[PDB]
Write a protein that binds this ligand. Structure first.
Ligand SMILES: [Zn+2]
Length: 260
């Protein structure tokens, strides 16, 4: 019957569905409207883990906060580090911690899905073919999306974009963009740092402040007001992954192109 796999975030469900089809029944630990960095799994969720045949970790220390509770919920549960074999980027803040947001890189997702499929075929060999097949289809979908995002951003005069939460480092890396984070987690306590950001923005004529759906937009609205730019939201946990990245790229493009 359908194999019960659990994942940390909505985007992973997208990948598991593409790879597993009706052979998997995916459960998500962190809701899309929540900040996974300060998320605490609920008791009902820990209880349900006893049925999970495996759990797909994002890796790179993303699940560290509840990593142990997971093993305690089920030691038999196979932990799938979907980030293995990938060279990570350093976090914007402290330059000695890996950046976990690799699920927003189409190219890197190819690797993530490949690790998932390989692992699903080990627990359920009979369907090894459907997994490898679904994987191939998905990969090709990825290269397509990758190429599509490239034609939207490549010609953009402006390569920098201001974000609240720094969750697009890997995405901005693939398409030669630079995210300027409003939030930090261990950098310089310079209370005026946000002022340097505003002046840099004004001089480069940045026209938009991209806040994240999972966080308050207060500080982004203020920043934007001061820079004279607009405020838009990007949803890094959107379940509708593929279509979401395209909308994102499109917003970037509308903001980083010669303006009216
Ligand atoms: Zn994040």
């Amino acid at each position: 019957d359908a194999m019960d796999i659990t994942v940390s975030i909505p985007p992973q469900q997208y990948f598991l569905e593409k790879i597993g089809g009706d052979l998997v029944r995916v459960s998500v630990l962190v809701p899309g409207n929540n900040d996974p960095h300060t998320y605490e799994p609920k008791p009902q969720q820990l209880a349900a883990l006893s049925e999970a045949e495996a759990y797909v970790l994002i890796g790179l220390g993303f699940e560290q906060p509840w990593l142990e509770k997971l093993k305690a919920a089920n030691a038999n549960m196979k932990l799938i580090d979907s980030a293995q074999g990938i060279t990570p980027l350093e976090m914007p803040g402290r330059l000695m911690v890996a950046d976990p947001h690799i699920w927003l890189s189409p190219t890197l997702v190819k690797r993530q899905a490949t690790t998932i499929a390989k692992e699903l075929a080990e627990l359920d060999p009979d369907n090894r073919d459907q997994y490898e097949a679904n994987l191939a289809a998905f990969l090709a979908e990825l290269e397509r999306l990758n190429q599509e995002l490239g034609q939207i951003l490549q010609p953009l005069p402006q390569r920098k974009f201001i974000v609240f939460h720094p969750s697009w480092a890997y995405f901005a890396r693939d398409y030669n963009l630079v995210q300027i984070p409003i939030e930090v987690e261990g950098q310089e306590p310079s209370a005026q740092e946000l002022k340097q950001l505003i002046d840099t923005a004004k001089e480069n004529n940045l026209t938009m402040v991209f806040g994240e759906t999972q966080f308050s937009t207060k500080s982004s609205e203020a920043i934007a007001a001061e820079i004279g730019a607009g405020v838009e939201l990007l949803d890094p946990l959107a379940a509708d992954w593929s279509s979401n990245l395209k909308a994102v790229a499109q917003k970037i493009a509308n903001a980083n192109s010669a303006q009216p």
